[PDB]
Design an enzyme around this catalytic site. Structure first.
Site, short mmCIF file in Angstrom:
data_model
loop_
_atom_site.label_atom_id
_atom_site.label_comp_id
_atom_site.label_asym_id
_atom_site.label_seq_id
_atom_site.Cartn_x
_atom_site.Cartn_y
_atom_site.Cartn_z
N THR D 1 42.45 -35.15 44.35
CA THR D 1 43.56 -35.74 43.63
C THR D 1 44.76 -34.79 43.62
O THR D 1 44.90 -33.97 42.72
CB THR D 1 43.15 -36.12 42.18
OG1 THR D 1 41.80 -36.62 42.16
CG2 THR D 1 44.10 -37.16 41.56
N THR D 2 45.60 -34.86 44.64
CA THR D 2 46.87 -34.13 44.65
C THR D 2 47.71 -34.41 45.89
O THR D 2 47.40 -33.90 46.97
CB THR D 2 46.68 -32.62 44.55
OG1 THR D 2 47.96 -31.97 44.60
CG2 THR D 2 45.83 -32.12 45.69
N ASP D 17 44.62 -34.51 49.50
CA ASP D 17 43.50 -33.59 49.43
C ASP D 17 42.26 -34.44 49.42
O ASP D 17 42.00 -35.18 48.47
CB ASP D 17 43.57 -32.69 48.19
CG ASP D 17 42.52 -33.02 47.15
OD1 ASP D 17 42.75 -33.95 46.36
OD2 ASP D 17 41.48 -32.34 47.11
N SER D 172 41.49 -30.58 42.68
CA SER D 172 42.03 -30.69 44.02
C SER D 172 41.28 -29.71 44.90
O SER D 172 40.52 -28.89 44.40
CB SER D 172 43.50 -30.33 44.05
OG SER D 172 44.24 -31.20 43.22
#
EC number: 3.4.25.1
Lengths: 202, 202, 202, 202, 202, 202, 202, 202, 202, 202
Positions: D1-2, D17, D172
């Site tokens: 999550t990024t 990511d 991440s």
């Protein structure tokens, strides 16, 4: 609130405890928890009465219909996969209650199915039990059961599950009921005769 | 509650643990957690029984139907994308449950799909596992997996994940089941034969 | 947050992960999680930093004191039952945290002890691990561990437990530290050299 | 999550990511977070998987539709306003999830849109990012960005945000996917080639 | 609330943000966040003002005391392990607040220590930042740092972290203050001169 | 989130802050908070983006429609009372968001309307402001306003409110935009020319 | 509940609002919120009365004591740091309230301090204010303030803050009190003469 | 967490399950749950480890003390009535944890004691058990016990309680520990020899 | 709130207590709790007045309708099985309240049925009772009842339960009401005559 | 948990039920609830075991001490008003539990005292009971008690209460125990003999 199911050679044995348990108060000194839905199938209710209550009638009627519309007495493993479906309908909803269905498959033999409130079903090949005082009864089986046992060696072990649980569970343990499903039918044992057994026992 | 999928060369392997976990009480000494839906695809349930229960049936039909309405056996990465949709529908809603689906694509070959209760779907290229005791099982694989480990060195490693988790998770670990899907089919291993392996292991 | 311990033949091995974790953020790219209190005993903290942190200082001192006042380096299983009591003094109170002590008893040989924030103590004759990323580590060991695996086959397995957890936990896995306690002492591997091993591995 | 979005002269860059994050566990060593909907547009989800997951599919469709229905490939700054609306639709409702869309409008040029789960939308003229590890990535950009930084000085900068975040965010940091939309098309970088860059960097 | 620490060759650098944040309102256009306890050590406070506030004065006293009773300006790593204790005294209690101390140890050279409100302590070998908008400042560092970056490349990088966060954090970013401790002393930069750098920069 | 509106002679002024606020993070270095619905009317949203967002579109459409069905550019105080209803439709519901609409009514002249998320509306004859950082802006006005302060003294005073609130509010104060509606039209200031004024000011 | 402090050349000004606020009710048409403690120092309370009430008395004495004990009239920046400690005493405890102290230090000139109920302290070099309707008053100051505004251009700017707030805050704004501490003394303005000023203004 | 106790003719038996249970994770593959405090008495702990852990030591001391100070080995039902008290001291307090003690009273004979975390005591004349999987174990006893069952028929029965409970309880069932106290002493069974029994059984 | 029913030879008896209990206040010195619905059946409510009230009416019509539509006075054990149904419909819903129905089956004789708010139903062959002060009443029956008794020894005992309950329950016990159903009819006792009995009793 | 006490001619009767109830499980087939504290007084606990337990010992001591200190066996109603006091000392505190004390006063005669966990006390001239299933017992008493019912008619009644309670209460009624205090002493019936009665009963 305590039931037992187990396969022993020929067919299947089912027993319960005629004890209704209204919080602190003992409400019913004799409450059915063992119903015969079809001539080859029968079941045991555990838990929320008024809920299982309907689930019985709201089912037998679906059996003694399927039997008619298509001859074959609702094959057990089929009637079961209803409940699995019937319950799960009320997942989005408030449903609840336990359940064991035990009946003789026209051909495939004896069958024993366990059932949780949500809709979880499993075929129990060996033995299974449920109720307020289930894990008590359980322990009995898990150390007193052999693939083969007998017609006799079953209904004995059977009681002797209830016998423990019924005197080690605040909620189970008033009177006892028992019926056996086998190829040719289903016998509800009229209390009096049940008793005979633990007499001949210890 | 513990399952495992991995791609190893030719096809794809899956395993579970026939343990059912009624809170404190161990409820089912043999609970199916691995289902074949279509001659070419199979899946593994982890979590909410009667929920994942229905999602099976309420998916198998859809297959042995697409199959029919259009020859090609519902290509796996399509069928998967059903669940991503079959799930997500009940987002606004109380759905839930884990899931791994694997199958041999008519052409594209083997495929393996993880899946969450919401609807998040991910193609796993290597190996993935799910179930109460999954992170255990996980360590195993992620220090016991190579790109190209034989039709054998996979179903070995498979067990061994369960071997670990089953005996280091309160919830998993009663008996074991396994099937391997490959171009020409899907093999449900009849308990007895599985065993041979860890006998031929350590 | 992910520590291991294990008895392989001669002595005992210890391994941490140099990862501090502040909710979402990664706070310390290198946090010591492995401490040697007394020339023959070393321990690993797991969990509540500044709570463990003290339990360290607030203990080493107790050791290099016992030692002095009575020669004998505080035998491990005697220092441990200190923590059991040290912890349980703050039962009524808010103490907390994990911990593994492993030392070479003057004569009793190698020892390995697990420890919970209440005071629960246990000797691990085999292996034990602890940490946010523990049940990953644990899966490696339980299926990669034999009564008698060399000083080599132990520090190898030691790494591959961490190798799994570290990259299958959101909270473990920034760097690694390793020391081994053996009759004559306690080696604190200086990073660089540690790495030599997973190079010579896969 | 990024995820990261930024405009550099010609066109626009997107990077993710491949890291899935089941709370403590790391659930997908390789999860797509960059989707191309239309020949001229591409987007990056950040947040609730199966929610975003659908929002991809339940959108791509509307694209390659508007496309057919009226020639023009749904101009980005219009597809976007769908989301503004498609999201705000489940305002009365439980919707959720971030997003960044970037595309090359037939004529208007490069465009880049930020998007909150409610429906909040803002065209980003400069650079924007979002996800568990967004504010990390950010610092990079807000101090490594100039109006006119080549096609190259773009995708270099890009990784280096993720390079920071992936290694300072518990959530991440597993793998990286990158694509660039530019007038003529949308290039999904196949893992191998991507890496080439930070090799040529430091 | 956003402070930095980092070790560049010779000595150590520290930077803050003179921005006080009373919830919604910006309460102080200029709030010192960087304090020099002893001629060789300096620290930065992050978060709970009136708490850290006491912890400063409730400490410098301790230093310019130890200093007296025993010549050796209270060596950094020893002062620090005060706070480790100082804080953890009030774990049982409601204490809180962040910390970074950095000094030139009479002999051992440059030191840098991070510090969480519980009392958790760690020496930072490279770089470390705390503060409402810390995670921004970090990314800058984690991708703008090398073992041996000049006394200059240090304070350059130091501001550019705060340059980032100060304009990507609702709480940080109203002015800035810097001091660098080196063997011979500790330089508080008088606002006006600081400004210089980001102008000789970009 | 800090907007202003005030009536200075001929017509009416509106000004915002291009600063978006994702909790701690500052998410948009430039977010439009001032919209022109119809050639005689304009508004300034404040608060719930994705919500106000729709409310602009789901409205301008109504404007340039009424405008069509019956010439008269939907009079201000009449489009206003839409909102009053528009909002209050979702009182039974979860609506929210702030609003200021000001226009030149065909005949009645200049108008200014305050607006809360429930549906409450007031004609402000003097001046009015809303926004996370409103009350600051307010003070400026309430002591820097006279019935008849020129078209100029108007947009001078208008910035100087924002001037304040933008550097005394954690949530406002990244960039500024301004528009003035007057009988003949509606002037959006392209950022560049805006600045001109605080240069000529102090 | 709304006070102001600011430095203007020579000395420092302080102003309040004689308005008490028992929730809904207005409970004191005339309440002191500015206290002179020592011949060279004066302070303003905002917030919990009965608490502040104490903090005045349980401080005054300490000044007109230190005074006697050691000639020098408690220097402000010292007395101040009492509070810093006097507050932080009841951190572990439920203390609360705001404060602005201002005095002329025997030698160091004029001094102006802000104070939060925890014990957070900051010398304000420029201008500061606090209380229910503080942020209103602020706006005024932040755009009507310059390094060198006369003895007059101060007390003027002063009222005008309050002016705004007292008529834009539900809780401030009933009467007003003002005093000025300058080298030779501390002047308490008897209501009547105060008034004179805003008559002479606008 | 599953212990049992029972009186069979001469003396008394006790049994545990060396299974520790850190919630989901199985923590200790071998956790001692049986302790001999004095040559003629022995006890079992079930539940809160580090609490009972202490309770053991914090008692042993008081046994091998009483013994000295007055010869006679602390009579069982006198030792017991310490616990009753040693618990109820911490009623006002957060104590907790289960317990059975059983020893051969100097003259009075075999004695067995049940004990709850408050201080509930009863002498069990027949058989009793406790722990996470207690009722399972119970059932076994309640229907498998006779007043006068050999020394042998009782360690048989015991196992089988556990045999049961250990494989019908998510929390019990990792290994089994047993001891027997009788006039002349207390036998702790070394794992290997325990085993002999359920080999000579079923 | 305290009703009773029991079968004695020929017929069936019912009795209540004319008390309604509005929390602390006694609200009805005479509230009917005993209702005849059809010439051969009569029932008793307990608990939620205005809910049951309805369930009476919303039932007496479904009786004297079936009666018409098909002669046979809705046979008891069927009518009841309405209530088992009528209740449960509002399981999903907020339904509640106690109930005992009992009437002379055309042929099958005397019947007696209990009933809970969820719609559980259990025929009572002996005696049962319900209501705030039920169990008191219970204790009387369970130790004053025999299979046969008589018409007389029936209604004598019956009161004698209420005599207890009504004088050991805060909520029961204002006056009593009584009716008996038997083959040929259903007598509702008119206050005065009831009395006679405890006059000829003790 | 169901005790009784009633005065009958000469002296006073007590009775309990040897049933303990660990929530759902029956934990003690025989737990003592009837205690003699002094040669002329006896008491019965009900409810919270280890608390009451203590309140016994922590009382019998105070008896046979007063005894010695001053000849006269602690007279009941004085003894009693200890407990009224001993209880209440811990109202400020968490004390709890039921109680009936019954003893023959040296001269005044027979006494029977009821007691509540806070310390309320009432001498009962007639009869009173207590414990989970108390009121059931109650209804038997209130309707089977005469002023002057022999030594015999009492103890007959006595069991008879228990007979109902135990057989209508989830938590009472595993076996029974009985004792009668009377001038010359206190008979603790040893199970076997008790029995005789309900044999010579119904």
């Amino acid at each position: 609130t305590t039931t037992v199911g187990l396969i022993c050679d020929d067919a299947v044995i089912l027993a319960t405890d005629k004890r209704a348990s209204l919080g602190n108060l003992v409400a019913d000194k004799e409450a059915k928890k063992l119903y015969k839905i079809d001539d080859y199938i029968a079941m045991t209710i555990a838990g929320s009465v008024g809920d299982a209550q309907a689930i019985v009638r709201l089912l037998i009627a679906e059996a003694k219909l399927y039997k008619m519309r298509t001859g074959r007495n609702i094959p057990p493993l089929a009637c079961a996969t209803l409940l699995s479906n019937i319950l799960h309908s009320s997942r989005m909803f408030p449903f609840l209650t336990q359940i064991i269905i035990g009946g003789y498959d026209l051909l495939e033999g004896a069958k024993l199915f366990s059932l949780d409130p949500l809709g979880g079903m499993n075929e129990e090949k060996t033995f299974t039990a449920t109720g307020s005082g289930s894990p008590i009864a359980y322990g009995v089986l898990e150390a007193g059961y052999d693939r083969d046992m007998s017609v006799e060696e079953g209904i004995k072990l059977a009681l002797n599950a209830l016998k423990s649980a019924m005197e080690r569970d605040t909620f189970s343990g008033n009177g006892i009921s028992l019926a056996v499903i086998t190829k040719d039918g289903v016998k509800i044992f009229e209390d009096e005769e049940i008793e005979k057994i633990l007499d001949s026992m210890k």
